[PDB]
Write a protein that binds this ligand. Structure first.
Ligand code: ZN
Length: 152
């Protein structure tokens, strides 16, 4: 019972984790994301159009994580300490403004770690079913787009 957008924003972290499990470290860098209502889009740097099989697996794993109802942990830490603890992987391609010394790090254990200060659900179960609507690879930009939506 969080707003729909809070659930969708939380889904981005679950979807990213699935993307990395399926596609590997080559897709670990988020370029951008966007949420509107129950719809979201995750854009990561990648070098090819995933196969229908890979796409189906990303969706399955995302939903499996939701069903597990794992906790979505938030750690507030000095920026340099977070860097020592999590390394470069907690960041996306657009660096957090340099003046930010207090960082909030979102952790879904063994799934995804990301510096993000937005509101999130407390557990992955609160997100609800996730459906991948469209996947688009922009060869010229080296970016992979994953469009999805929440069933509630
Ligand atoms: Zn977030």
């Amino acid at each position: 019972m969080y707003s729909i957008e809070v659930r969708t924003h939380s889904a981005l972290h679950v979807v990213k984790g699935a993307v990395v499990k399926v596609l590997g470290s080559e897709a670990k860098w988020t370029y951008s994301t966007y949420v509107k209502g129950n719809k979201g889009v995750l854009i990561v740097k990648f070098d090819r159009k995933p196969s229908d099989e890979e796409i189906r697996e990303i969706e399955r794993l995302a939903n499996e994580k939701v069903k597990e109802n794992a906790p979505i942990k938030i750690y507030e830490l000095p920026r340099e300490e977070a860097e020592k603890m999590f390394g470069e992987d907690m960041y996306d391609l657009f660096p957090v403004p340099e003046d930010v010394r207090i960082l909030k790090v979102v952790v879904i254990e063994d799934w995804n770690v990301n510096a993000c200060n937005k509101e999130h659900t407390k557990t992955t179960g609160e997100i609800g079913p996730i459906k991948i609507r469209k996947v688009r690879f922009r060869k010229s930009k080296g970016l992979l787009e994953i469009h999805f939506e929440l069933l509630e």
